[PDB]
Amino acid sequence: KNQLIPVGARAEVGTTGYGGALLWQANPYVGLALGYNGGDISWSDDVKVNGSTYDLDMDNNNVYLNAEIRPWGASTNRWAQGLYVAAGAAYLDNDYDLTRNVDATRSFRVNNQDFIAGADGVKINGQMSYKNDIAPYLGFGFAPKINKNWGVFGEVGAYYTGNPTVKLVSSGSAVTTGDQSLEEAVNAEARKIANDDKYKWLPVGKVGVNFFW
Amino acid sequence: KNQLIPVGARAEVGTTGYGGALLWQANPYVGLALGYNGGDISWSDDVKVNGSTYDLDMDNNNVYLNAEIRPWGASTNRWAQGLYVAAGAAYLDNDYDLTRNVDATRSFRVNNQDFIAGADGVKINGQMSYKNDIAPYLGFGFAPKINKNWGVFGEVGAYYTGNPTVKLVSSGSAVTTGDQSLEEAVNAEARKIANDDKYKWLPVGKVGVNFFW
Numbered sequence: 144k145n146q147l148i149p150v151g152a153r154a155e156v157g158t159t160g161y162g163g164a165l166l167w168q169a170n171p172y173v174g175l176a177l178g179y180n181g182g183d184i185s186w187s188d189d190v191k192v193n194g195s196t197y198d199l200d201m202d203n204n205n206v207y208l209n210a211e212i213r214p215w216g217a218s219t220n221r222w223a224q225g226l227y228v229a230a231g232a233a234y235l236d237n238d239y240d241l242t243r244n245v246d247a248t249r250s251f252r253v254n255n256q257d258f259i260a261g262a263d264g265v266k267i268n269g270q271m272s273y274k275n276d277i278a279p280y281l282g283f284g285f286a287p288k289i290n291k292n293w294g295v296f297g298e299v300g301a302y303y304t305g306n307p308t309v310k311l312v313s314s315g316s317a318v319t320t321g322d323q324s325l326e327e328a329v330n331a332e333a334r335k336i337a338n339d340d341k342y343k344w345l346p347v348g349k350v351g352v353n354f355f356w
Numbered sequence: 357k358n359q360l361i362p363v364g365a366r367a368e369v370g371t372t373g374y375g376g377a378l379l380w381q382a383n384p385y386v387g388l389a390l391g392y393n394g395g396d397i398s399w400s401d402d403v404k405v406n407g408s409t410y411d412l413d414m415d416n417n418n419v420y421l422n423a424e425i426r427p428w429g430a431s432t433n434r435w436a437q438g439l440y441v442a443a444g445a446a447y448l449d450n451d452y453d454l455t456r457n458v459d460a461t462r463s464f465r466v467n468n469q470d471f472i473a474g475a476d477g478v479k480i481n482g483q484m485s486y487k488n489d490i491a492p493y494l495g496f497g498f499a500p501k502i503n504k505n506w507g508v509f510g511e512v513g514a515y516y517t518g519n520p521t522v523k524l525v526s527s528g529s530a531v532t533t534g535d536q537s538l539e540e541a542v543n544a545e546a547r548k549i550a551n552d553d554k555y556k557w558l559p560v561g562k563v564g565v566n567f568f569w
Binding site: 194247248249250252256257258259260261262317318319320321 | 460461462465469471472531533534
């Protein structure tokens, strides 16, 4: 068979958007996925959690190329054959815009300090963007085949992106007994995101369907 | 066989204390339990939940007489034979003394209003006593036999006691933006317990071991 010809394709939905990939298989152990994840969703819910409401906007525009390594690639066992480690890289462009609306008189926590929203309530808005011409990726996947023609998968990994760009702002007044004012607590949180090790990785979870011709 | 002679005894531990009962069986469907639940425990934990620590003292001194009705009493099936409805009455004497210790700067909620403890923290103490010369009881039990000589059980029910006596007091200062001061919120909660329908019943959960001679 010709190495340059893909063996199949997949459709996927996950935390970095939806889309899919073309798939090549060099041998039972080593394969390649070239994909796009994009789109943009707006989850504006209304279910109150403890007096707060959250609104999430997300815009994605990612292109990725992964090697997939299957340690049990030649197995006829469907669970074993489906297990893989993904290593590769991607062009990343991801914007998150999260807004927390705190009801009047309700408590909420910012930078490990408790606050209580005043009579007019409190709004906290966060904008956070991951943009990388090329970011390395490592992940692990489980892609059991249902038969020779199709299957389903899940994949979890992370891109090493460095800290994202971040802008956090609050509106409204709050009472507190902690060390920081609301404004400082908010800026403290912006600073953690811009600087802590934890935020130098963009975690990824996706699920989807594989098709094989 | 002689009706006046008990068929067995049980040991039990539950929310109204520990102890046990003597058991009579009039026929496979109708039996009687005469028991004592007493003791007194002090659960002073240290595991912080959201900046609060709780300390619980409980003192019990209850005598009860229940009829137990087994709709499937003549069954050899152990699950079916073990199912019963309990109806009876008890002398009740139960004291609860619950103390919530709120760390400095942490939020906590009283009478559906959020508060944040000041620099010196906040203590909330509640004393609540159920005392009844005779209170009706209804409950449901599951007492599977392991063999003819022994078994295990659980029972859940409630005594109609009317509202308990209640004393709630706070110490320390707190900030808030709600309608009530801390003192009023605390007294509001005392009033609910002294007056709401919900508190006119003392719920009971117990587990134990049955012995048959």
